[PDB]
């Protein structure tokens, strides 16, 4: 059933500080003795997290939002916490996830639970000293169930302890792409209260493919009932001392340190303080004395968007590749394609091509790009001369049939065709130029059939001495060697112009936003900053010019005497006349270079240790 | 423009469609050989006529270009091989008469009886196994009377016609025309002269003279057991008692003369049968050996186009083993494979020929041949020599894993091999010298038989059983003599093959006697061999020879080193018997 717990004293919420906790492994790649800078959802250091107690009763279990993942620390001595519930409404109207740990198993279910108003687990007898699970008031019913998992059976102690908290359980919950990622860690502790200091790397625990909408969540605790708790179900119970800290993760950049054992030992917040930003930029834990300007005031952009022209037309590659016949090399087939979306991955991985070489462009990176035009040039050649279709190559084909420019920017595909256009007796339909007066300019076609003259005397359209037919004929048979079998060659050339792109890779166009620090991708070119309605980009969906403001601004300088010397630093604002500052502090001195904070100005004039500008020199003293 | 540019353009035009016509003719010939029928005969004849007409037209057109202007030294070779007026010099009636003479010679050699009692089905069997003095003498005399007596005036007219043609071709004699093959010009330190070829042959022949003398004396001594009333203690051996119609080879004599007959010879027929080789494992082993040396693979088309067994009783086809280079990257092998050691060795030989053909395919059409006429068979034969060693057989599972070798078996094997390798050198030299002298005109038309038999008694050391007059023409009974075939190749082939074997054994870091040498698993030897194989005819043969052995000219010393233990054994055995022959002695 469900009962509303009463006789509970209400107290104002308490808050504490997160002393360098909530550090988990970003991935599953082994790194040893290395400093890795990576941006992801982490709890900022020394943040203000919320503290809840269980001891006045104070049986606190409110419903809290699940914004971007929750960091949950728990100080326990008797395993009062029993599990959690996540969802959107938690009233059986929306799909809800219950992760509970009873005295027997661990049950993870994703169902439309009709959750009780005050869910709890009221587990004792005087005559025999034994604690057993007795009450489970979580949900009225579950109608539709999608995911269900039960852990192996185990026996829980369920026994209360009169000592201090001995277990510290740290969990990180994230909901990314319908996947609930849980990172877990346990630590033996001996303390009275407050968050312990130190460092701890959180290891991944589970990645459940639930695929549900999670907005709110609640923690499920345990109750103890015996002869010492008289009354009804709503009053005849105790709480049991426990505590837990709750915090929210934010998208931040962190510098992680890996020791010789491959474990995480230290973490640095990158957009926390100017000293931290300098440490992150230098990718080291020690910074020498000097002046540094990393980027600007600290800021981590919120999201990322992509804006690509909308052309849902499947691009016709099957027309060219799967063609009945191909033209001769001396008269090679040209086709132009535009206003289409091309899936280059299937073409690259069709696993039926003898040669596939892309010049100037990475074979995989070209998938998500935008191009103005594409040219497909097709013909049939001999196996030996396929290598001649490449920039800077020389030969008969490269000088009389098909010339390729040195600064090529496309791809070349070629595959064997000995089963299609090879017949006994000789397929005398394919020709090729063998004698030409001059060379060929890049991307040139000639079909002239004038007889070539090599001698002094001109022959009047008649063959003979020093006069030959210009075009020779290939012969093809099913019994030639590999070097003489026919090969079908298709060259793709990508043309880029300032005109709006017509060919683009298969991607999404996410709704655009304004006045937000975002990582935008327009027509294949990426950038970061704030988009302002009006360097400037013309979006392909409404043809509206948007200006790119570099988010934070104001050239900020930092003076340090060395990490080993001291942590005291001086902050200089070069465009502020003494405003937009991290903190006004003290030692505010205005010079031609700007406003300096944290450095003492003296009436003397010593040798220049740390130059700043306009004849100003500073140093660190007692 | 310049003559060189025009010549290059003409050659570029020629090679295209030269390859095409050659491929079509070769395909027709292969179809006829694999599938014998009248229609295939007509196709082959038409293709051959077309190819010949195209060659004549191209030669006529190329005659215009003067050779003096070309200075590229590669176009000049192709033009010189192309500017071959040749038989077109003779008059049309003269050409018809010459063709009729040659056709009549071929027909009369093919159609010969002494009965009934044809040459191939029974005459060779008698000459190899009769064992009767009277029967062998009768067959020899009957064949001589039936062939040489008839072929005298035809051969005389042929000689005068061919000598006239050679003289009209700006050549001193037809012998000079043949010897023009061993000629290289324009290279300092490598050039050769036609007159140098007549010398440098007798020198090495005299170098091996004591070995041949010892072998001949030993053979005479051993043969005295049979025909006691016909063998002289000193003198020349009777002509008909050589186990051959002409005595070119002494292999059949091996049965009579053995030093240690108790020791069995090496044979793997039983092992092949027990392991049940399916007439394809042989080629697999050959390919594996050639790969292990370091040479490339075998093309996929070779494994399906070529036929390596009898087609069956349904379809007939002559299957004298052959290695076919059809052009345009097509390679085939024609054999009737059976489970014998001889088939194993001949398969290795043909695979070697195929590898040699693969090596130089990148060269233009006019230069796709061996360095000279003697390189190709030597290259094909050194592979069989290397693969015939007992060590190589023991490496394969066919031979016994635990086998012991004794020097008696080594001596038996060396004697059997020497009965063929060295028994033909004096005969080849004598026959080619006689033909050269006949062509030169030194010998009068009434002294042919006398001079021929004098040379046979002196050089070869073999005497005729009965005298013959000037009516007879004994040397015309040979296949090569009557069919206009140059014959010096069978002399230099052995020299080249033994020089190559010595060079490879030295470069492969092997120790011991030369006859116990194998070159498998020797990448350096393979690379050195390829550095010569890939040359083709582009470079002078002297330079190609230097690229392996390191000597500009051929040396007979490696051959002597090969048979040195047998030389010592023969000297020890002949320390008591006489050495030499008596010229004056005759059977009658
Ligand atoms: C061409 O035909 C093949 C054969 O089925 C097919 O797999 C392929 O999708 C077709 N189109 C292209 C562009 O290759
Ligand atoms: C050989 O040629 C005849 C001619 O008709 C043909 O019937 C036969 O199939 C051919 N044998 C082959 C190609 O193996
Ligand atoms: C001859 O011409 C060819 C052109 O194919 C060239 O490669 C070669 O170096 C030339 N040799 C000489 C000696 O001129
Ligand atoms: C072949 O004919 C040509 C053309 O007259 C001639 O120059 C050449 O000497 C002839 N060859 C001979 C006579 O060997
Ligand atoms: C080519 O030779 C190598 C050498 O061992 C062998 O592994 C490979 O299978 C051969 N390939 C073909 C196609 O013969
Ligand atoms: C060679 O064979 C003979 C045959 O009896 C034998 O006596 C001799 O020891 C063997 N070895 C040598 C080196 O002669
Ligand atoms: C060559 O090497 C192969 C590789 O194991 C070996 O099986 C074979 O016995 C070797 N042959 C010789 C003659 O060394
Ligand atoms: Zn051969």
Author numbering:
A (entry chain A): 14 to 68, 76 to 143, 145 to 555, 574 to 617, 633 to 676
B (entry chain D): 19 to 133, 141 to 613
Publication text:
The SARS-CoV-2 spike glycoprotein is the major surface antigen of the virus. Its function is to bind the host receptor ACE2 and mediate the subsequent membrane fusion required for cell entry. Here we have examined the structures and receptor-binding properties of spikes of the B.1.1.7 variant first described in Kent, United Kingdom (now termed Alpha)10,16–19 and the B.1.351 variant first described in South Africa (now termed Beta). Recently emerging variants of SARS-CoV-2 have acquired other substitutions in the spike including a number located at the monomer-monomer interfaces, at the receptor-binding site, and near the furin-cleavage site.
To test if the cleavage of the S1-S2 subunits is directly responsible for the greater stability of the trimeric ACE2-bound S1/S2 complex, we expressed the Alpha spike in the presence of a furin inhibitor, decanoyl-Arg-Val-Lys-Arg-chloromethylketone, which resulted in an almost completely uncleaved protein. Incubation of this uncleaved spike with ACE2 resulted in more than 50% of particles being monomeric S1-S2/ACE2. This conformation, like that of the Wuhan strain S1-S2/ACE2 complex, is incompatible with the trimeric structure. The data show a sixfold increase in binding strength for Alpha spike, and a twofold increase for Beta spike (compared to Wuhan) arising from the shared substitution N501Y in the RBD. The substitution of the asparagine at position 501 in Wuhan for a tyrosine residue in both Alpha & Beta variants leads to an increase in hydrophobic interactions between the aromatic ring of Y501(RBD) and the aromatic ring of Tyr-41(ACE2) and the aliphatic moiety of Lys-353(ACE2), in addition to a charged hydrogen bond between the phenolic hydroxyl of Tyr-501(RBD) and Lys-353(ACE2).
